[model samples]
Target: SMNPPPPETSNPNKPKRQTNQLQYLLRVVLKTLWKHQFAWPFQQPVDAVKLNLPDYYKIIKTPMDMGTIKKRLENNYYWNAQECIQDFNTMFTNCYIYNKPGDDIVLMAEALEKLFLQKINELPTEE
Candidate 1:
């Protein structure tokens, strides 16, 4: 039999569960970039290079300028693409959460909170 679920906490500082789809997409992009390096200047990164160029170009229904992407990333809280690079590196090289169960859960929660906060600010409201 599976173990019982842990008790939920009432801590005000505890992070909520994240369910935003945009956040997931952004994380995939970030993680892929972490595993691969982009070429300098206008060159495409390794992840993009392996794709069929025509198909890749066709899929982007709307493309934001590089300036906008950099601006958003820099402005984001924990989801900042630049900062995630370092965080990913640290986690990959060392023990993720440094083997501490309590702190790891809290850190993961905080990261999700950051992603959720950014999502709320950026996503359009539904009628």
Candidate 2:
């Protein structure tokens, strides 16, 4: 068999990367909200890692209790998926007002809102 590629090496002198807590929290929130399809974006686990895909599903499941999230985010009210999507919209709006990363995130929030709307609309009603 052909020789395998050499093992990867690390840069000892490089600074350790700082984790983006907000992004991490957002990812986990999305995972807990959409675990049904969160794993769909990947063909394989290796593809996920190779693409640096968000690994939020690894941390939580769908219909996850929001108590801990409320506590961590210091929000006074409980929230559901729709409510969370609204909050994300508001937060992204504020980010836009402050000239931060907003457009793409707000778009995603809107898309999620539409998804929830579609899901609700698809449910059967009483005859």
Candidate 3:
């Protein structure tokens, strides 16, 4: 029988695997998504919707729906990298919406709507 000390050595460059292949791939995919600029920056502290109204409305007008958005989220929405970056910027940096203490869902939604209105008066028009 061999008594070995814990493998937690002083080495910092070692890569300790914490998951299997499926999980690793999934995590990588999600990491890529997080790095994407079109995912609305997730729980960012902003006061706006975090995306381009005209452009996004243009996107929405083209038979796109929430499901498409969800799928895009899966693949990191590379439709327009610039717009994606812009979207994220608007959400987190430019707009900056966050749920402070005592903020309710209605208020949050209303706040987001206000942010949208503040950005753009009207969304894309139907042809």
Candidate 4:
């Protein structure tokens, strides 16, 4: 058998490279955001996902809550997705006017709940 390539020597001076693609992606994303100074254009603002080539996905999403039940409960107030989207837009743009990240998440959760409820409510009820 051919001799195995002598234990691929790693450079001691060089920074340890991240093996995790997600971590690499996060680094790139953060770098891009910083480069753009919060003006980066994204198809879905803070939607936080990718298809086919899945990257690092947060176990907890932006403006994340304890759980979906918590989200449903929280939806009592904001009541629409646009409300949440707008909340994020306003917060990110204005740098959190009297609110923060959690506030934005709660708003989004509310929007999601509203969408579900509206859809369910619109179905023709049996007489």
State residue 42's C-alpha deviation in candidate 4, in Å.
18
Model 3 lDDT on a 0 to 1 scale: 0.33
Better of 2 and 3 by TM-score: 2
Report the C-alpha lDDT of model 1 over 1-127, residue by residue, as the tens digit: 1222212222355433323433543455433332332212111221224433444324432322222332334344333233433433332223233224465534543454344345434443321
Q: Ten residues in a row with the worst lDDT in model 1?
A: 37-46
Model 2 / residue 110 / CA error / Å: 1.1
Q: Per-residue lDDT of 1-127 in model 3, one digit per residue for the tens?
A: 2222311212345333322322322244334443444434343322123332333332222221122333344444333323322342343322223233454543444454344344333322222
- Local error of candidate 3 at 124, Å? 32
**Candidate 3, position 123, lDDT:** 24
Query: Across residues 61-98, which tens digit of lDDT does each residue of candidate 4 receive?
Result: 23321222123223332333333234334323332332
- Which candidate leads the pack in TM-score? 2
**Local distance difference test, each candidate:** 0.33, 0.36, 0.33, 0.31
Question: Cα lDDT of model 1 overall?
Answer: 0.33
Q: Give candidate 3's TM-score.
A: 0.22
Better of 2 and 4 by lDDT: 2
lDDT of model 1, residue 113: 38
Q: All candidates' TM-scores?
A: 0.22, 0.25, 0.22, 0.20
Candidate 2 structure quality by residue, lDDT tens digits, 6-107: 212223453333133333333554344455332232111222244443443343123122233333233323223344445444433432342334555445
Show the colliding residue pairs in model 2.
none
